Ligand binder design. Structure first.
Ligand SMILES: O=N[O-]
Ligand SMILES: O=N[O-]
Ligand SMILES: O=N[O-]
Ligand SMILES: [Cu+2]
Ligand SMILES: [Cu+2]
Ligand SMILES: [Cu+2]
Ligand SMILES: [Cu+2]
Ligand SMILES: [Cu+2]
Ligand SMILES: [Cu+2]
Lengths: 336, 336, 336
């Protein structure tokens, strides 16, 4: 397309919503290619990640960890207005793995505090993709400070299985998984700092051990449990997008399965099926489609169970509906 | 199916055998759906995992690590009578990744010492699947104490490759891989504990390093070597089922290949072919089919070679038969 | 085929070239099966792997880390003359994951300093495969000292996509990734040893932490950056072969994608497409095909960004050509 042709395309302003929820969108594209506009303000802020009051100096796109999910369709253009407030202390940028050229846009979006930039790229490949900040010289530091999220580029005709049959979800959730490296003092107590830069040296030392002190969903232990558990009902089709910008993960829905799982996150790669636990490598996003058949609580976890239950990588789904005794039944309940 | 229809189905009681062997079964299903009955007694027992005499207080389904492989066909029902003897000290349960509902059955099988329970579930999806204990609040501790195994749900028509060609194995082995986290004293020597609970706190500290002290097959360093090496013959077709309930692994058969590998362990997901080294994420089972072509010793290992040779993840196959010089030949033997 | 037939096949000697470059070859086979001959001399030598003068006693096939890429076609025979000079101190051998029998040839090629051997094997399976030294009892030490490389067994008809369409590259690079475990003294300074054997104990202790001190491409931090960045032009089709003999990796081309990626490295397994970040398990090689669409610098990294930017696993591609504003454009450059 020429610059003139692009200029004539309709524009649509999207309002982003906080993970794990996803902004309003349509699975099958409504109309021809459009320039979908998004705006995100970067917020450097303290976040408490566990019940011991442990703090991380988050570098958050749109104020959240992970950053919000942006949804467009293949061959639409995604136009992001990225803002770095003067209240922030560091330069930041954005690299969209879905984009082609200039380090995913990273080389064209370096903005110092007090600056903004507008990047436009053509979403030529369908799938879920990670996006993350990557300032030359301080790349992993920003990413493990939570400056990452993902986008979904739906096929114009919506999702399909490996045989071309349509797959239409009733609900969609975005689970961003984050590995944190929090410095400790000589007594094993996590350290606190009053400036992001003050923690750099100490954090790099923990990062080099390749051993996170915490692995969490939606920015903190318990963020997607209790009252913030994701919900669904028996019979509902749910798409669960999961990303990890720096480290491998292996999602599992206990009591359920990944009926269709685009493990590589790319829709032109046929989905694996009947999955018990899938694998998403660091630096990628993946997506699993499941139709709930049983009511009750489901644990959604990174299946290295130490990471899930000792380090924080566990979420819950609360499902309503009727119990199916054909699928499962307690013939004899626990008894002497 | 209705309760009455299920009650009318034939029942078949199966006697389990210890890994790496698999109880007798038919690859192609005989007759229509059946309620296949299994019984397992949980044993908290001390086991030795290396030649130095290192001890682990194992939590073992059927007394072994891994727990035994249960084999059924798609749409059969698996009915497990699980027993927790009064000689044990902890509550245990079972989560079948092959099952649908109540955390794989975990929420319906919590039994204290002195109790038993019978769980029945419909094996709706074909493939190999992990099963493991998961008591709320002490999940990884039970799993990395060895309380896990796998089941195989065969398609009713047996196995086939990705294009519909039948694949019939001559023998099958189940290799359970276990990551252990054994506390050490100030001399770097592994510690021993009078009772299992005594080791909890020290063990959790090692678990948090995400660095196992031992990674073994069939419960101990060298368990599948020597008189206990697996065996085959040139021309023989072998299916190797491999599981890891908590941590990633990358199986490799040195001198051979994975002719067909259901890396995700799910039979409706076409198998990868001609594999050198495959990958099974923690929380899953995988299966590889190979037709041996050369006699001699083979090393079957987790291909992070430090985990294989320093930590214990190495097994052997002894293969009888005639050497094939077309496939490989020493043109000049080691010489000056 | 018959005994006479094999003996009558043409024998062709090929001159190797050091990574990341690849020796002369044709994508589509030229003529019928041939016995392709290679010779490699093993060199034990001290190499510097970072900007601080850190040394490693490398064990290098053909004097390089990784060893060179050997290219043959399916059903050709690869006949390697492996030489271990009297100036070396250790016994070495070679295990080709592409080969069938005797631990990949390892059991037939054990050569002490002052000896040579010639191994021939039929390359029956198409794909990229790891080869590595594996002396019984000291396997990981040799592999993590850099004694590994890869070969590519191209289909006789060249590469094809999942639908059977030809994929012809304009150039190919081989990126060998190496995890090193260098001992440090109590002050955190890397240690130096007079002979390879002197470092054995200290090195195995670091290996057991499963935490590399360095993760590098082509043998050193920054070996594939700056004046040694790989190159391409917009419109050029590039195949990037990547191997890791001991540990997992997750390659990503920043600003680009893996248009077709044989993640398992095996050509009869259909390639995944539109990949952002692919996964290659330790003990395997993978291959990615990409057609460059934008000029500029690209970062090619292991996407655990700590491993890439703190440990050394980052390379660059320098691409010439015309910028495509349809694909990406700065609508508003960074500004107040
Ligand atoms: O779902 N926990 O294995
Ligand atoms: O099987 N050792 O590469
Ligand atoms: O390519 N760095 O995310
Ligand atoms: Cu940033
Ligand atoms: Cu990236
Ligand atoms: Cu238990
Ligand atoms: Cu589980
Ligand atoms: Cu060697
Ligand atoms: Cu190997």
């Amino acid at each position: 397309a020429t610059a003139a042709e692009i200029a004539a395309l309709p524009r649509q302003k999207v309002e982003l919503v906080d993970p794990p929820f996803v902004h309003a969108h349509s699975q099958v594209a409504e109309g021809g290619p459009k320039v979908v506009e998004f705006t995100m303000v970067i917020e450097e802020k303290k976040i408490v990640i566990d019940d011991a009051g442990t703090e991380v100096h988050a570098m958050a796109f749109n104020g959240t960890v992970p950053g919000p999910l942006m949804v467009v369709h293949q061959d639409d253009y995604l136009e992001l207005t990225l803002i770095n407030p003067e209240t922030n202390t560091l330069m930041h940028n954005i690299d969209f793995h879905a984009a082609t050229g200039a380090l995913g846009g990273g080389g064209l979006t370096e903005i110092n505090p007090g600056e903004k930039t507008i990047l436009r790229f053509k979403a030529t490949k369908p799938g879920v993709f990670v996006y993350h900040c990557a300032p030359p010289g301080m790349v992993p530091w920003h990413v493990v400070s939570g400056m990452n999220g993902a986008i979904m580029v739906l096929p114009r005709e919506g999702l399909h299985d490996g045989k071309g049959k349509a797959l239409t979800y009733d609900k969609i959730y975005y689970v961003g998984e984050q590995d944190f490296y929090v410095p400790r003092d000589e007594n094993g107590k996590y350290k606190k700092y009053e400036a992001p830069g003050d923690a750099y040296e100490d954090t790099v030392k923990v990062m080099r051990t390749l051993t996170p002190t915490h692995v969490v969903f939606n920015g903190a232990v318990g963020a997607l449990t209790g009252d913030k558990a994701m919900t669904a009902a028996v019979g509902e089709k749910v798409l669960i997008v999961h990303s990890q910008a720096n480290r491998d993960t292996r999602p599992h829905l206990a009591g359920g399965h990944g009926d269709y799982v685009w493990a590589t996150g790319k829709f032109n790669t046929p989905p694996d099926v009947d999955q018990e636990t899938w694998f998403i490598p660091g630096g990628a996003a993946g997506a699993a489609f499941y139709t709930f058949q049983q009511p009750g609580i489901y644990a959604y976890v990174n299946h290295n169970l130490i990471e899930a239950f000792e380090l924080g990588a566990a979420a819950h789904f609360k499902v309503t509906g009727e119990w199916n005794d054909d699928l499962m039944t307690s013939v004899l309940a626990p008894s002497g």
